[PDB]
């Protein structure tokens, strides 16, 4: 299982950033793709997830209304677009894999695979 994210981005306040995450080594649509933010000197914050099979999403209240998650199964890639960027959106953004909610053994409760973080500076 590999998760490969896009390179670092530098944006201005009010701009939007779209971070990609290319998945391989597993059935793409069999897992949820989560995004987790890590601001410098801070801990990990969950942003939301997308379910590639349905393109269904759920967002953390913190980012709801600013973050849009999409995916394209033909290239097994997930995307996270964070709009109206603020200076405090400077962070390393990770994509992470977790089981879907129908997983019997609660594999959805945790993130078993992470990509290399993508740094976005605002």
């Amino acid at each position: 299982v590999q998760l490969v994210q896009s390179g670092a981005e530098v944006k201005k306040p009010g701009a939007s950033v779209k971070v990609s995450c290319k998945a391989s080594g597993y059935t793409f649509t069999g897992y949820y793709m989560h995004w987790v933010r890590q601001a410098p000197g801070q801990g990990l914050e969950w942003m939301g997830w997308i379910n590639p099979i349905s393109s269904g999403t759920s967002y953390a209240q913190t980012f709801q209304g600013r973050v849009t998650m999409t995916s394209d199964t033909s290239i097994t890639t997930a995307y996270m677009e964070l709009s109206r960027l603020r200076s405090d959106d400077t962070a390393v953004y990770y994509c992470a894999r977790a089981a879907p909610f129908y997983d019997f053994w609660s594999g959805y409760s945790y993130f078993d695979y992470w990509g290399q973080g993508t740094l976005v500076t605002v």
């Binding site: 989560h34 987790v36 801990g43 990990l44 914050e45 969950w46 759920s58 953390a60 990770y94 053994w105 609660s106 959805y108 409760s109 945790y110 993130f111 078993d112 695979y113 992470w114 990509g115 290399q116 973080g117």
Partner: protein, 104 residues
């Protein structure tokens, strides 16, 4: 929910044992408690899930335990690679919450 890790910083010799604590503001099912290890310059990786179950590729030097509002991560023998930041994570109410992390 609030996830509280302690101590913020832990320091001891290689070859020794370390215990990392994580406390919850409310009861957490063991199935919903996980631990991660984030080395300097690297993404977080899963160590423990379901409170006590090791993730694939994780040495048996790592173990987890606990229930309710009190969980721990134990490193029976610390190696140079183990001196990283560890996080506890909870799932519930359709949300994923991380602790502030502790540095070993």
């Amino acid at each position: 929910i609030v996830m509280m890790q302690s101590p913020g910083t832990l320091s001891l010799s290689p070859g020794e044992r370390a215990t990392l604590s994580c406390r919850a503001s409310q009861s957490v099912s063991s199935s919903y408690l996980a631990w991660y290890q984030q080395k300097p310059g690297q993404a977080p990786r899963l160590l423990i899930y379901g409170a006590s179950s090791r993730a694939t590729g994780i040495p048996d030097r790592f173990s987890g335990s606990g229930s309710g509002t009190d969980f721990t991560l134990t490193i029976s023998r610390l190696e140079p690679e183990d001196f990283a930041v560890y996080y506890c994570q909870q799932y519930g109410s359709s949300a994923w919450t991380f602790g502030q992390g502790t540095k070993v």
